[PDB]
Design a protein around this ligand. Structure first.
Ligand SMILES: *[C@@H]1O[C@H](CO)[C@@H](O[C@@H]2O[C@H](CO)[C@@H](O)[C@H](O)[C@H]2NC(C)=O)[C@H](O)[C@H]1NC(C)=O
Ligand SMILES: CC(=O)N[C@@H]1[C@@H](O)[C@H](O)[C@@H](CO)O[C@H]1O
Ligand SMILES: CC(=O)N[C@@H]1[C@@H](O)[C@H](O)[C@@H](CO)O[C@H]1O
Ligand SMILES: CC(=O)N[C@@H]1[C@@H](O)[C@H](O)[C@@H](CO)O[C@H]1O
Ligand SMILES: CC(=O)N[C@@H]1[C@@H](O)[C@H](O)[C@@H](CO)O[C@H]1O
Ligand SMILES: CC(=O)N[C@@H]1[C@@H](O)[C@H](O)[C@@H](CO)O[C@H]1O
Ligand SMILES: OC[C@H]1O[C@@H](O)[C@@H](O)[C@@H](O)[C@@H]1O
Ligand SMILES: OC[C@H]1O[C@@H](O)[C@@H](O)[C@@H](O)[C@@H]1O
Ligand SMILES: OC[C@H]1O[C@H](O)[C@@H](O)[C@@H](O)[C@@H]1O
Ligand SMILES: OC[C@H]1O[C@H](O)[C@@H](O)[C@@H](O)[C@@H]1O
Ligand SMILES: [O-][O-]
Ligand SMILES: [Cu+2]
Ligand SMILES: [Cu+2]
Ligand SMILES: [Cu+2]
Length: 554
């Protein structure tokens, strides 16, 4: 009880192994989420959105390390199912609460509910979002903020800072055109924590920029989350240094930088000290042009307003000269050093490789992303956990199910995700923080690659980097994780369009121990409701063909 005195995690600290030890708080944080169909004018232009409780971003789930969180999700829409995923939450022996349509549950139909219950067995910053088709990017997402230890001190916690791309047509409206094109999706603008201005065709300014206020001398924590559909950002604040203290849910040895490159699904916790002359400073979220197509890359900005700065007055500050805003990169392996030091014990690991390609299918054609040789093609109404309940020793996986088996308790898997294309992708794994062993450009060399096993970066989302066409294209990333968590775990590109097109596989982990978590009633109650919806509403039927809005299932 000498550690972290007068905190909810008294008896534990920054050195506690949070994979093995959790504070007991006895506390349950209970949330009620209505998923609603509405409109909003987040940058001053009205359009349809799907929201949690009428808010964008959705309300923050806030808890202390070791709490239990209970989220009652009710579907108040007409024409979508829903499922809510808690990104980066380990869900240890709790796979059926992971919120993945077609894996861990059927979708929740309109007028039905699902109660997610999970343990805060990590601390730091993340987010929840729909894991049903493109719905997260219609606005169904919000923060997860779990208080706990930190690797540097500060005075004020500003909470979540979401980074989003945005357009005035919806992602669902765009989807058919995306499917039928070899060009990446184009977005018109972006939002910082759900706000921006917009310049109209007649040069009027509508909307309002994100703004935050600093007291000179004070230190502020910002919890950055990239929730964009198809944009890799560099975040910066003119004239201010940023001290990075965590990557995803893993506290790291702090380091200071002038910008944070942040991929879709990733989080970084930063501390900013108000040590500049009192003034207004631009906060910038800049799409990286190699892998983002945005009409307004230089106008996704907010305002840092010091007390002492002019009111009603935009910044005139200059961007940090950190180089170009072209490549889509992570912090390097040597920059991200987990504070809790753990080695990747990959002796005796199972080795796998999943290639990434983009291929035409059918007569239109539709251009689909494939991972490990197949575009994922699975079933909302027949989720993987139903298949294994019906047949506990099932071995007859279809190619289109994209299965990677990890049957042996605690045995490591080393997975190489590779591509020949000049296109990078943020790779996210459910149910695990993976160990990031390598990340590179060009061809993967099985002889020459060095794997970092000595306290490598550890997180839940990392880029498969790729070279530009002039440098030959292609790239790879290599991850390691032990089979410490029975369940069916999605591994996929965190670009929504890509995952829905097929860029996803499923890790079937310790299949013989699904009894540790599985509830037939929790599965079938929702599946039965979903079937009743599908009878009366065409949106209840999954489009799985090649002349319409193909849905991979996730
Ligand atoms: C970004 O938007 C979120 C969601 O509205 C804001 O969340 C608040 O965060 C603070 C600090 O953790 C909490 O006190 C509030 O309860 C949250 N409100 C919610 C979730 O409705 C967040 O403050 C915004 N970020 C900034 C920097 O303004
Ligand atoms: C997910 C969902 O329910 N979306 C619906 C949409 O289908 C309908 O066109 C609109 C107008 O009624 O309301 C909203
Ligand atoms: C504004 C809008 O999108 N409205 C659509 C409507 O045209 C359609 O008939 C209905 C069912 O698909 O969904 C809603
Ligand atoms: C409109 C509709 O069909 N809804 C029915 C309603 O009678 C019931 O009260 C509710 C809660 O179970 O869900 C069901
Ligand atoms: C669930 C589903 O769509 N089943 C299809 C069937 O309709 C189709 O005739 C066949 C050949 O393409 O492949 C399978
Ligand atoms: C793109 C593709 O291969 N789609 C197939 C579809 O033809 C088939 O009907 C279905 C069977 O469940 O699986 C999927
Ligand atoms: O109210 C929920 C939480 O929101 C945030 C801060 O404002 C805290 O003071 C508060 O506990
Ligand atoms: O409206 C944008 C798109 O929406 C969806 C389908 O209705 C398509 O036919 C259409 O092109
Ligand atoms: O491209 C025009 C397109 O706009 C949007 C919808 O109103 C569609 O019905 C229409 O086809
Ligand atoms: O392909 C789905 C849908 O896309 C758009 C239009 O071309 C429609 O006529 C068509 O039905
Ligand atoms: O995050 O999926
Ligand atoms: Cu996830
Ligand atoms: Cu992708
Ligand atoms: Cu996911």
């Amino acid at each position: 009880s000498s550690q972290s005195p007068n905190t909810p995690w008294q008896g534990y600290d920054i050195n506690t192994n949070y994979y093995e030890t959790i504070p007991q708080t006895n506390v349950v944080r209970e949330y009620w989420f209505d998923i609603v169909n509405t409109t909003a004018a987040l940058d001053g232009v009205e359009r349809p959105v799907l929201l949690v409780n009428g808010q964008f971003p959705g309300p923050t789930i806030e808890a202390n390390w070791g709490d239990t969180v209970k989220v009652h999700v009710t579907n108040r829409m007409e024409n979508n199912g829903t499922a809510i995923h808690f990104h980066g939450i380990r869900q240890l022996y709790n796979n059926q609460m992971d919120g993945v349509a077609a894996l861990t549950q059927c979708p929740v139909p309109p007028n039905s509910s699902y109660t997610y219950v999970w343990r805060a067995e990590e601390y730091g910053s993340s987010w929840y979002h729909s894991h049903f088709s493109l719905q997260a990017w219609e606005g169904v997402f919000g923060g997860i903020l779990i208080h706990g230890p930190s690797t540097a001190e500060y005075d004020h916690d500003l909470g979540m800072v979401f980074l989003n791309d945005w357009s005035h047509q919806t992602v669902d409206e765009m989807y058919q055109s995306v499917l039928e094109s070899q060009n990446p999706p184009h977005f018109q603008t972006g939002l910082i924590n759900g706000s921006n201005i917009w310049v109209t065709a007649d040069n009027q300014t509508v909307g309002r920029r994100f703004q935050t206020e600093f007291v000179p001398g004070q230190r502020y924590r910002l919890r950055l989350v990239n929730a964009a559909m198809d944009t890799h950002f560099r975040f910066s604040i003119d004239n201010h240094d940023l001290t990075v203290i965590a990557s995803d849910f893993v506290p790291i040895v702090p380091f200071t930088t002038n910008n944070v490159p942040i991929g879709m699904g990733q989080r970084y916790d930063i501390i900013v000290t108000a040590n500049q002359a009192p003034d207004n400073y631009w906060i910038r979220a800049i799409p990286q042009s190699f892998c983002s197509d945005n009409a307004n890359s230089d106008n996704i900005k907010g305002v840092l307003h010091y007390e002492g700065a002019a009111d009603n007055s935009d910044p005139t500050s200059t961007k940090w000269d950190y180089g170009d805003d072209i490549q889509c990169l992570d912090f390097s392996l040597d920059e991200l050093v987990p504070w809790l030091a753990l080695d990747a014990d990959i002796g005796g690991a199972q080795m796998a490789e999943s290639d990434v390609d983009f291929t035409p299918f059918g007569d239109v054609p539709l251009y689909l992303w494939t991972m490990g040789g197949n575009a994922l093609n699975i079933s909302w109404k027949d989720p993987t956990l139903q298949q294994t309940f019906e047949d506990p020793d099932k071995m007859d996986w279809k190619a289109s199910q994209g299965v990677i088996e990890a049957a042996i308790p605690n045995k490591w898997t080393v997975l190489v995700v590779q591509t020949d294309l000049p296109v990078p992708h943020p790779i996210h794994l459910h149910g695990h923080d993976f160990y990031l062993l390598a990340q590179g450009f060009g061809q993967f060399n099985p002889q020459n690659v060095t794997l970092k096993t000595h306290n490598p970066p550890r997180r839940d989302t990392a880029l498969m980097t790729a070279a530009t066409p002039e440098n030959g294209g292609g790239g790879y990333m290599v991850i390691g994780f032990p089979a410490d968590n029975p369940g069916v775990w999605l591994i996929h590109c965190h670009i929504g369009f890509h995952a829905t097109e097929g860029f996803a596989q499923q890790i079937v982990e310790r299949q013989s121990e699904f009894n540790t978590f599985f509830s037939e009633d929790l599965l079938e109650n929702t599946c039965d409701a979903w079937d009743e919806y599908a009878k009366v509403n065409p949106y209840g039927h999954q489009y799985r063909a090649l002349a319409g809005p193909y849905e991979s299932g996730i």
